[PDB]
Scaffold this motif. Structure first.
Motif, PDB file in Angstrom:
ATOM      1  N   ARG A 134       0.893  -1.374   0.078  1.00 53.73           N
ATOM      2  CA  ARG A 134       0.101  -0.052   0.008  1.00 53.73           C
ATOM      3  C   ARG A 134       0.927   1.282   0.159  1.00 53.73           C
ATOM      4  O   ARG A 134       1.784   1.318   0.645  1.00 53.73           O
ATOM      5  N   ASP A 144      -5.165  -0.386  10.016  1.00 51.90           N
ATOM      6  CA  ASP A 144      -4.317   0.616   9.735  1.00 51.90           C
ATOM      7  C   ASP A 144      -4.651   2.231   9.854  1.00 51.90           C
ATOM      8  O   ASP A 144      -5.310   2.396   8.825  1.00 51.90           O
ATOM      9  N   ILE A 173       5.827   6.453   1.434  1.00 49.94           N
ATOM     10  CA  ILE A 173       6.081   5.473   2.290  1.00 49.94           C
ATOM     11  C   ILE A 173       5.224   4.168   1.991  1.00 49.94           C
ATOM     12  O   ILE A 173       4.046   4.105   1.796  1.00 49.94           O
TER      13      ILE A 173
END
Ligand SMILES: NC(=O)c1ccc[n+]([C@@H]2O[C@H](COP(=O)([O-])OP(=O)(O)OC[C@H]3O[C@@H](n4cnc5c(N)ncnc54)[C@H](OP(=O)(O)O)[C@@H]3O)[C@@H](O)[C@H]2O)c1
Ligand SMILES: NC(=O)c1ccc[n+]([C@@H]2O[C@H](COP(=O)([O-])OP(=O)(O)OC[C@H]3O[C@@H](n4cnc5c(N)ncnc54)[C@H](OP(=O)(O)O)[C@@H]3O)[C@@H](O)[C@H]2O)c1
Ligand SMILES: Cc1nc(NCc2cc3cc(Cl)ccc3[nH]c2=O)ccc1C#N
Ligand SMILES: Cc1nc(NCc2cc3cc(Cl)ccc3[nH]c2=O)ccc1C#N
Lengths: 411, 411
Positions: B107, B275, B126
């Motif tokens: 992701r 998350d 990231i």
């Protein structure tokens, strides 16, 4: 006349937090509150000299007196043992206090309106209770082909049961066993229900009982039945509720929310240090924790952060520091609030409230330490004029606390 | 003439994302790319009509043609069974496709210069990799007191190792075995190293090897082994690197970083739905999710968000919608980019990159949907003139994509 506060266990700790702690006592507590103070010195040097006996006495004293307020302490590693010339690698004081008191640790960030949150819409507190299950995992290496089995042997001599974990037919890997006792799940539910009632927010339990139907299912079932049997009536009388959520659903609903709830997280890692969201607000300087015992009688309060060594090294070298005392202040105000609650002490309950609100209002009025200015400004663009040093900030709270308490003498 | 794109498996989905998906096809892909298009309709009604056979055929087609691009689908709950009069509560197509293909999910947020990040420092992407641990666990009820043990018997019969998981003394509870094969950790490392080399970013592995010294120890060891033996050379070539990090260290470092790294997350706690950071930016429509099979050759791309039901409701009632299609567009560009790598297709590699740039460039020029304009300004200060609706935004991208591809005869 000062307020009669009654019985409080206080634990001194290490490095920068030790410094700030004395400022809080000297400037914010002692000028207004008279305590029957049970002070234990959990500085690393005193822990060493007493062969860690002070940590045990302090724990036993919280059990007896119901209200602990703890400063952050060095958990020694091999580097600390060389630095202090310690007799041995003393276990974490927090570990020692936990296993004597039992309890569930709840963490909460303190909201200031001028300090951006991860979700801008978060304006009410989010309170996370963790259980502890990685902490009681038995993990090993599977060196090559063979069977891993997990077995249950009744103490009463009835038939052992055997469950296949995995048949490694080619190559090795890794395996572990994890458990939870009904007794710990019941304690966690009770601590969880006690907190929601005391703060008057709703309670959520998050699990993955879709995948772990048995393991997580047990958490859902024990929480549900303790709710119905023991807490539903009280919850409805504060117009709050308890509800189970799948973790996917809980996270989603929490990011849509305004906050204002307790979140009991059945989880593998309950550490502050590995939680992005704990680390993605202000500093750990705005994160407070309380260990709540299932009785709803006994509470220990601390900052969720450490001894801020980095800042302490700066303070020994004579250099200006800007260390956030908010989490440490809120250890004191949560302990005194709990003291006030147990003794029906309207004056101490007011004082504790007043100090929380002066803390938020001072930061909201533009008076803050560097960490908080870096949240508004970005660290590269913070100027000395954007913030106060540790002593300047503690003096400003002292000024504002005096004024709020003088004004409150109209009721 | 148009570009010859080759074989792509496309999956149609539900509600608002289905509208946007067709608009992306008609305005951004089909005017410039001819595909050997294997289209599967994974809309809830066609899943029901076919008894979810369409989902199983679509997965098989991804295995055969190596490249899938998937639209968001409805995962039925009890309310969806009611709404569509479903025959069954059908399993998530994502789940069915994941468990059929296996491999590693990555992701990645899409970064714009003028859209604020959860952390200001973050100016480079990231990328989180996680395996597709707790899914293959054996959990059970410890009905009462007795010994729970885990035991390893090598197939050669030369040893028996028994570890105490827990001695239950005060009632019962739950227990659980978990495992990992060395091949699964190796697949996860190879994917992680390949992604870092493919993107020109350094790679960090995070574990909790302070607590799970053996379980997470093996992860750390296999990653280091695979690096030192077959990736260190190419990593030094591209001036990047690989390091293990304790999760506690990795988070703190990550919040203080600029981004631009691959993050291999060993974490049972770990998938995009649980998350909170990923939900933040996922729900902006600025997050993609690429499944990457062990082989190195098969990928499925999609937006890390749902069908955006609320916006579909607004559209059914004739209200103006401002739905962000960026994550849906980046699912196409990531899928077309991989198609191009397999087929050695410079023209399609160029087109894919050109569409990502157009999308980012359009937002950076101040043309964006409501949610993005809300990020910059705050929802209360957002005026109609600050954003484009779904169709105005897709028109702008199209117009801007036509310009940039026309000027593929300038330099
Ligand atoms: N007793 C406890 O509750 C507890 C729990 C954790 C650790 N510890 C102990 O604390 C010692 C130091 O640990 P550590 O340095 O890793 O963790 P730490 O003391 O929490 O400090 C980590 C970093 O976070 C920032 N920070 C933390 N608290 C802050 C505050 N009040 N105001 C401003 N910034 C703050 C600072 O970042 P910058 O350097 O970027 O400014 C600081 O260096 C260790 O010996 C450890 O065992 C104790
Ligand atoms: N296959 C998949 O990819 C997948 C994954 C998860 C969910 N789903 C399915 O999606 C359905 C709907 O779930 P949901 O609506 O709660 O989740 P969602 O589709 O992610 O939307 C949740 C909220 O996030 C915001 N949002 C998400 N994507 C956006 C975009 N592209 N542009 C603008 N805002 C966006 C919107 O907030 P505001 O309303 O405040 O604007 C929206 O209401 C469910 O039936 C579920 O089964 C499938
Ligand atoms: C309003 C706020 N409350 C915090 N409370 C503790 C906490 C919340 C939380 C929420 C989520 Cl959605 C995920 C993890 C979390 N971990 C925490 O320790 C932590 C951070 C923030 C922020 N910003
Ligand atoms: C720049 C950016 N990158 C993202 N990448 C994925 C991601 C990062 C991440 C970082 C941290 Cl520190 C924790 C969890 C995370 N989960 C993610 O899915 C997610 C959000 C944002 C933002 N803002």
């Amino acid at each position: 006349k000062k307020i009669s506060g009654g019985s409080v266990v206080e634990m001194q700790g290490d490095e920068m937090t030790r410094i700030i702690w004395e400022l809080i006592k000297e400037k914010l507590i002692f000028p207004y509150v008279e305590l029957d103070l049970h002070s234990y010195d959990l500085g690393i040097e005193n822990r060493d000299a007493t062969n860690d006996q002070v940590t045990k006495d302090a724990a036993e004293a919280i059990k007896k007196h119901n209200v602990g307020v703890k400063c952050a302490t060095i958990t020694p590693d091999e580097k600390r043992v060389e630095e202090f010339k310690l007799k041995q690698m003393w276990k974490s004081p927090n570990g020692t206090i936990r296993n004597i008191l039992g309890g569930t640790v709840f963490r909460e960030a303190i909201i200031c309106k001028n300090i951006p949150r991860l979700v801008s819409g978060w304006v009410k507190p989010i309170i996370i209770g963790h259980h502890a299950d990685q902490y009681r995992a038995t993990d090993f290496v599977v060196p090559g082909p063979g069977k891993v089995e997990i077995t249950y042997t009744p103490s009463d001599g009835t038939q052992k049961v055997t469950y296949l974990v995995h048949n490694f037919e080619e190559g090795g890997g890794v395996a572990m066993g994890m458990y939870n006792q009904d007794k710990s799940i019941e304690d966690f539910a009770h601590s969880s229900f006690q907190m929601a009632l005391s703060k008057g927010w709703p309670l959520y339990l998050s699990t993955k009982n879709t995948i772990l139907k048995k393991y997580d299912g047990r958490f859902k079932d024990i929480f549900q039945e303790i709710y119905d049997k023991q807490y539903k009536s009280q919850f409805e009388a504060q117009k709050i509720w308890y509800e189970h959520r799948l973790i996917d659903d809980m996270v989603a609903q929490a990011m849509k929310s305004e906050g204002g709830f307790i979140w009991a997280c059945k989880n593998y890692d309950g550490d502050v240090q590995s939680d992005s969201v704990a680390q993605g607000y202000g500093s750990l300087g705005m994160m407070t924790s309380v260990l709540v015992c299932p009785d709803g009688k006994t509470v220990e309060a601390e900052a969720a952060h450490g001894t801020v060594t980095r800042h302490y090294r700066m303070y020994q070298k004579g250099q200006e520091t800007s260390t956030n005392p908010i989490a440490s202040i809120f250890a004191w105000t949560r302990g005194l609030a709990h003291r006030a609650k147990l003794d029906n002490n309207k004056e101490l309950a007011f004082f504790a409230n007043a100090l929380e609100e002066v803390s938020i209002e001072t930061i909201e009025a533009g008076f803050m330490t560097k960490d908080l200015a870096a949240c508004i400004k970005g660290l590269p663009n913070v100027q000395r004029s954007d913030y106060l040093n540790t002593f300047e900030f503690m003096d400003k709270l002292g000024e504002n606390l005096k004024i709020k308490l003088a004004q409150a003498k109209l009721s």
